[PDB]
Amino acid sequence: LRKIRAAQNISKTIATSQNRIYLTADNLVLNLQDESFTRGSDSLIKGKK
Amino acid sequence: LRKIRAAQNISKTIATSQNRIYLTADNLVLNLQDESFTRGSDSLIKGKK
Numbered sequence: 489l490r491k492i493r494a495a496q497n498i499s500k501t502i503a504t505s506q507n508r509i510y511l512t513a514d515n516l517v518l519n520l521q522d523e524s525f526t527r528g529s530d531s532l533i534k535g536k537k
Numbered sequence: 538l539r540k541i542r543a544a545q546n547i548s549k550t551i552a553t554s555q556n557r558i559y560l561t562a563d564n565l566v567l568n569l570q571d572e573s574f575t576r577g578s579d580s581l582i583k584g585k586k
Contacts, residue, residue: 507554514561 509555509557511555511557511559514563516563518565
């Protein structure tokens with residue numbers, strides 16, 4: 489069983505490492521957006537007294 | 538039956554792995570630009586009356 493032990497150790501050493509890949513999430517938001525309008529102006533002639 | 542289920546499990550364990558590339562980035566850097574320079578290396582001689 490010393491034989492088995494050695495085999496175990498070697499097999500495990502070879503075993504390393506494992507592989508896995510990522511599906512990550514990104515958080516944190518500090519993007520405040522401002523206001524905008526739809527421009528509106530008319531072609532007019534105005535006059536004051 | 539058992540053979541099928543066991544085969545399923547073995548195949549499942551060995552096969553699975555994920556390769557999903559999913560990354561986003563967010564780096565915000567703030568710099569200050571106050572009123573800019575208004576100068577030039579002009580050499581002139583001046584004096585008050």
